[PDB]
Amino acid sequence: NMFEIAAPNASEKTIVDKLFQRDTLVRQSQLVVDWLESIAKDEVGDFSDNIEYYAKSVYWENTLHTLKQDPDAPIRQKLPLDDLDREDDIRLLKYLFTLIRAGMTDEAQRLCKRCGQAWRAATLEGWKYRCVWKTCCWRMAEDEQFNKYERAIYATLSGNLKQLLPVCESWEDTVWAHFKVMVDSLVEQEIRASIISFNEANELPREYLEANWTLDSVFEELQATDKKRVLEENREHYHIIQKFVILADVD
Amino acid sequence: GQLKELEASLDEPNEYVRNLERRKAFSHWLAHTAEERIEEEVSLYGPERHVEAVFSFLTGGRISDACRLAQKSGDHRLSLLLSQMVGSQEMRELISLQLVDWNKLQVDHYIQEERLRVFCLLSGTPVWRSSDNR
Amino acid sequence: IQRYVENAQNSASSPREKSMKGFLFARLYYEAKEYELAKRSVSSYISVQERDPKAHRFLGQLFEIEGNVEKAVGCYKRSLELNPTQKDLTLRIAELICTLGRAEYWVERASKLFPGSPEIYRLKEQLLSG
Amino acid sequence: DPKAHRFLGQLFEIEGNVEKAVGCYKRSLELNPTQKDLTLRIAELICTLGRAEYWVERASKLFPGSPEIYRLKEQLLSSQAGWNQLFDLIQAELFARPNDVYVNLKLVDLFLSRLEEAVLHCLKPERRALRTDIEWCSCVVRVFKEYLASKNTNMRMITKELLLAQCDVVFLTLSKKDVQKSKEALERFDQALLSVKQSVSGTDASDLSVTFYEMRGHYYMHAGTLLLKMAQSCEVQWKALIEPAALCYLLAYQVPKPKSKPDNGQGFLEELAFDRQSKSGHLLLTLSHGKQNFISEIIETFANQCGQSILLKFLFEDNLSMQDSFMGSDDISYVENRVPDLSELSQHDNGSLRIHNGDLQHLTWLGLQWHFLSTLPPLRKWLKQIFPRVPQETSRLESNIPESICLLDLEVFLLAVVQTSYLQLQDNNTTNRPRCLPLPICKQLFTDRQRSWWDAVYSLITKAKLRSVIQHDLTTLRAQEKHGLQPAVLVNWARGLHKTGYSLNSFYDQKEYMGRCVHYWKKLLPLLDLVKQKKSIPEPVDPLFKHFHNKDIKVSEVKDLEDEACIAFATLDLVDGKTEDAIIAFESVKNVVAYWNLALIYQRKAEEIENDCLPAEEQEEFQECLLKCKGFLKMICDEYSAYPSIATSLPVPV
Amino acid sequence: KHIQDWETAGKVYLDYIRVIDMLNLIQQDESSGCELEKLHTKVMSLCKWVELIHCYTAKDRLAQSEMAKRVANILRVVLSLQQP
Structure with a gap:
């Protein structure tokens, strides 16, 4: 129980270590998400317009030239944006949702850097109050005017679901989504019980889903199709087989 | 003063821990003494201006209200930096790199003149002699 | 950790209801x-807040x-019916329903x-027991 | 209130x-309760209106x-005159900052408008910088003023040099998009060349004809480069004006070497010959890799008049007749079949670094051309010329120290730059038959970070000294604590070091060189160990060089990299003395280099020791022949000489 | 299983109707204790859900208030018939 030993002066790092050595079901769900990311479908760097064409000297170089003739920028000032850079950013953010939903995080950062996308680097630079930061992320994802895949990336890294890129979630991808949701909700309730986090940090209590879904409801939601149907990837057997093997309802 | 601080020196006070507690209380003092002046600047300024409003709030503290005021501009590249501050040094070193890279491209002059100063505040360069000798 | 008990005591004097405070402080005493x-x-933390799983366990075990x-x-009944996080409570609820028709519901x-x-x-x- | 004072002052400004x-501002300054900055605008206005000398003072x-x-x-002071006071104040400025080519331009312009004084203090900075269209045009203006004021040999010597200076300046530096800015200077150069050759047919005692040969080769290479300039500025590096380019470059490479060997330094002529011939060789390599091309050039692109016409109209858009004042008198048939070599090329490249000291642009151009010919540059000779006494190594590679800048670390950084710039450009829409776009014409090769560190290193070597730049990039180079460069860079450094160091015959430089190789591969092992569907290293910032789909050494080649590392370590041990556990360790690698090192080991050890050892050599060579049957030249020296003599002394043993 | 939001609204309405009917029947049918316990559990769950009803229109508010009132009355009646 050394990882689950903690004190009042023990940081959130150690409180999370206690949760990680403690929760069997949650750690199993975390390994489940790890598998979702281990089975990764990726667009290539040097062979896809993702960044191979969006490898400009800097972002919005087309817009800058037009003006001569951060995400704070257009959010504050509405109309200015230019379409060439807009499309370049569409392809880049598609690449980023791809790579990160695959879980190649330092590679996605290598992209955000070798291109140098101020908003990309900034929004995704934090190593790990923190609750305030997460609520803020949720609120920014809720805000309008940010791209599709980037919006989904932010909602996810915050603990909420957009749909733009999450329009493209497989049974295993939306499984990663719903399992990560259960795990993040139990994580927040875990810190709240381990009161170490501050009150003013949960600045928007309801706008984050603190309550968690249980494994059976995660599976029911991931199986229920948007057409109020049974999912095709669900009716497939080998997926269903691995699913019962993980869910431990296998005999 | 070295007064009682909720049993700061409970069990074998480490030098580092003591220094950190001292820093915390000293910072609390700074925020308390500048509260009145900051409150007036909030009232005086009408529509929030990222060039001036952000500057005032940041140097006076209270990051929460600063974020509330920033409902209009969709930026939180700061809640991440000042409520967690996990990779602080590296993060801001990278932001400085990004800023100087834009400066090395002969652009970013269209941007409001002192919004650049708000960025320098976060990055860590107290004086920036730009390409235009500003 | 008397310094931490002093901090919990401060947040328990100011926020009188002191739900998280009572939980963490009674947990320190545990x-x-x-x-x-x-x-x-x-x-006290129970009459403050209805979500406490470890308080549920300690209090129910003390009484049992x-x-x-x-x-x-x-x-057990209160912590189970609030059901924000509690699983095993119905078990001892059934056991006590046996200690006193009713136990059949919880046994099923x-x-x-x-x-x-x-x-x-x-x-x-x-x-069921002739 | 300084704020109100300077607010009013700058608002009125x-x-x-x-x-x-x-x-x-002056009233505020004469009150002086807190202010200095009044003086500048005060002087400005006093100049705007006998008085302003006060605030200037x-x-x-x-x-x-x-x-x-x-x-x-x-x-x-020239107001309280004109030329006299201007020249005098400019001479005071030139006594305070003499090397200032611009102040020297001031002195020469004001003397011309002491004609010999203007000639002196113009011709000095003109050839001291040569990047100066300003000084060169003021020089031609001084020459015109001398001519019309008088209205010989030294002028016939320097006219070519100075007009080359002006032409090349406005050509490469102005980014003159192949328009009149370059054509006109080249055309005046053509006038100068036709004039000098038709008038003064210099003898073998004077250097007039010898510098004429120098500048004929010069103007020729620059004609070819202007043709490449027309291509780039119009659309892209063309298909039609490239054999014209190799033709001009032929007409300058194969101008004979001038060297007089008795003041009047003919070293000027030898060194301009060196640089010209080096450039000419590199471009006659790169523009036409393929052969069957250069005799084709001689036979078709030039003839008595057609070839000169074709190469004349291009440079000169209907401005010079063919028979009067052009290249018509000039004869081209005496050029024959001879390419530049990698040996004379190396010599003229050590001649190129004569006027290209410590230049990263030049070094990338050269290393990239040697790697475009796919053989790494003779870089250590260049390093031991440019940076004279820098020892080849440092005491510890485990402590990032900036006051120990290394020469091997510089070969390291420069191979990095060669590889990476090659990669960046190859992605930069090269996927334009010219790849490297000769040095005057191409744009950037190294990037901002690399330029910064190269110049800070030059400041550290060749001198408020900020050197965190030196510390940061030594951190990155030496495979140190928290590095951002990826395997590929360290790996290919270790590859260059492997080849060129084991190639060496120096004992205590082989030892240190393979110590560097051990350094690199042993430090490379642990990263590529963390290749388990998980990233290599953390990269918040593109460190100096971040590529992708290239840098990522995939999961497979671990076996070869590891075993080559084993050969590296056992090699460092074998050239240091433990030649028995060297045998043992080489009986852990199972490749051709394994059999070859164990064979050299048995041979060297028991030439005159034992016989039953040689059966091992027999079996080793039989393995090696079986492997060669598949076409394995993975050894460093081929087997046509390796197996015959070995199996012969084996047959001499049998 | 397939119907979305099925659990929330569907369960809410079903529970409301069933609770009314069962209350009435059981009161008349010698108040069977097991059924009373079931009713108690269900009414607690229903309280838990009424508070979470989302409002997009005005009709949502009115219906919500009505349901809350009725369930509170029923809850009081149930407590009265059980503990005392």
């Missing part, structure tokens, strides 16, 4: 050796061990929750 | 009100090295 005042403080099967039924419930349970089918067998 | 700003008594107010004081 980790340390103050079990009686830990019980009183855990009941001291023999107040009625107080165990109270703790336990047989629906955990099938390979000779002990649960046997608690049901006792409720 | 921006509304133009110089006298009102002088009034406000204030600025000078606080900072006498000030350009703006210095010229202001010179002009106010």
Whole structure:
């Protein structure tokens, strides 16, 4: 129980270590998400317009030239944006949702850097109050005017679901989504019980889903199709087989 | 003063821990003494201006209200930096790199003149002699 | 950790209801050796907040061990019916329903929750018992 | 209130009100409760209106090295005249900052408008910089003023040199998009060349004809480069004006080498020959890799008149007749079949670094051309020429120290730059038959970070010294604590070091060189160990070089990299003395280099020791022949000489 | 299983109707204790859900208030018939 030993002066790092050595079901769900990311479908760097064409000297170089003739920028000032850079950013953010939903995080950062996308680097630079930061992320994802895949990336890294890129979630991808949701909700309730986090940090209590879904409801939601149907990837057997093997309802 | 601080020196006070507690209380003092002046600047300024409003709030503290005021501009590249501050040094070193890279491209002059100063505040360069000798 | 008990005491004097405060402080008294005042403080944090799983466990165990099967039924019933995080409570609820017609509902419930349970089918067998 | 004082002052400055700003700011300054900055705008307005010398004197008594107010004081003194005071103040400025080519331009312009004084203090900076269209045009203006004021040999010597200076300056530096800016200077150069050859057919005793040969080769390479310039500025590096380019480059490579060997330094001629011939060789390599091309050039692209016409109209858009004042008298048939070599090329490249000291642009151009021919540069000779005494190594590679800048670390950084710039450009829409776009014409090769560190290193070597740049990139180079460069860079460094170090015959430089190789591969092992569907290293910032789909050494080649590392370590041990556990360790690698090192080991050890050892050599060579049956030249020296003599001394043993 | 939001609204309405009917029937049918316990559990769950009803229109508010009132009355009646 050394990882689950903690004190009042023990940081959130150690409180999370206690949760990680403690929760069997949650750690199993975390390994489940790890598998979702281990089975990764990726667009290539040097062979896809993702960044191979969006490898400009800097972002919005087309817009800058037009003006001569951060995400704070257009959010504050509405109309200015230019379409060439807009499309370049569409392809880049598609690449980023791809790579990160695959879980190649330092590679996605290598992209955000070798291109140098101020908003990309900034929004995704934090190593790990923190609750305030997460609520803020949720609120920014809720805000309008940010791209599709980037919006989904932010909602996810915050603990909420957009749909733009999450329009493209497989049974295993939306499984990663719903399992990560259960795990993040139990994580927040875990810190709240381990009161170490501050009150003013949960600045928007309801706008984050603190309550968690249980494994059976995660599976029911991931199986229920948007057409109020049974999912095709669900009716497939080998997926269903691995699913019962993980869910431990296998005999 | 070295007064009682909720049993700061409970069990074998480490030098580092003591220094950190001292820093915390000293910072609390700074925020308390500048509260009145900051409150007036909030009232005086009408529509929030990222060039001036952000500057005032940041140097006076209270990051929460600063974020509330920033409902209009969709930026939180700061809640991440000042409520967690996990990779602080590296993060801001990278932001400085990004800023100087834009400066090395002969652009970013269209941007409001002192919004650049708000960025320098976060990055860590107290004086920036730009390409235009500003 | 008397410094931490002082901080919890501050956040318990100011926020009088002190739900998280009572939970963490009675939990400090549980980790340390103050079990009686830990019980009183855990009941205080309980009357403060209905979500506390570890307070549920400590208080229910204190009552069940001291023999107040009625107080165990109270703790277990309240913590189970609030159901934000509690699973095993219905078990001791059924046990106390046996300690006093009623146990059949919870015995069927336990047989629906955990099938390979000779002990649960046997608690049901006792409720059924000539 | 300094804020109100300077607010009024700069607001009147921006509304133009110089006298009102002088009034406000000077009244505030003469009150002086807190202010200095009044003086500048005060002097400005006093100049706007016998008086301004006062505030010019204030600025000078606080900072006498000030350009703006210095010229202001010179002009106010020239008002209280003209040419005389201008020349005198410019000479004072040239006594304070003599190397200033611009101040020398001031002195020469004001003397011309002491004609010999202007000639002196113009011709000095003109050939001291040569990047100066300003000084060169002022020089031609001084020459025109001397001609029309008088209205010989030294002028016939220097006209070519100076007009080359002006032409090349406006050509490469101006980014003159193949328009009249370059054509006109080249055309005046053509006039000068036709004039000098038709008039003064210099003898073998004078250097007139020898510098004429120098500049004929010069103007020729620059004609070819202008053709490439026309291609790039119009659309892209063409298909039609490239054999013209190799033709001009032929007509300058194969101008014979000038060297007189008895003042009047013919080293000028030898060194300009060196650089010209080096450039000509590199471009005659790169523009036409393929052969069957150069005799084709001689036979078709030039003839008695057609070839000269084809190469004449291009450079000169209907401005010079063919028979009068052009390249018509000039004869081209005496050029024959001879390519430049990698040996004479190496010599003329050590001649190129004569006027290309420590230049990263030049070094990338050269290393990239040697790697475009796919053989790494003879870089250590260049390093031991440019940086004279820098020892080849450092005491510890485990402590990032900046006061120990290494020469091997420089070969390291420069191979990095060669590889990476090659990669960046190859992605930069090269996927334009010219790849490297000769040095005057291409744009950037190294990037901002690399330029910064190269110049800071030059400041560290060849001198408020900030050197965190040196510390940071030594951190990155030496495979140190927290590095951002990826395997590929360290790996290929270790590859260059492997080849060129084991190639060496020096004992205590082989030892240190393979110590560096051990350094690199042993430090490379642990990263590529963390290749388990998980990233290599953390990269918040593109460190100096971040690529992708290239840098990522995939999961497979671990076996070869590891086993080559084992060969590296056992090699460092074998050239250091434990030649028995060297055998043992090489009986852990199972490749051709394994059998070959164990064979050399048995041979070297028991030439005159034992026989039953040689059966091992027999079996080793039989393995090696079986492997060669598949076409394995993975050894460093082929087997046509390896197996015959070995199996012969094996047959001499049998 | 397939119907979305099925659990929430569907369960809410079903529970409301069933609770009314069962209350009435059981009161008349010698108040069977097991059924009373079931009713208690269900009414607690229903309280838990009424508070979470989302409002997009005005009709949502009115219906919500009505349901809350009725369930509170029923809850009071149930407590009266059980503990005392």
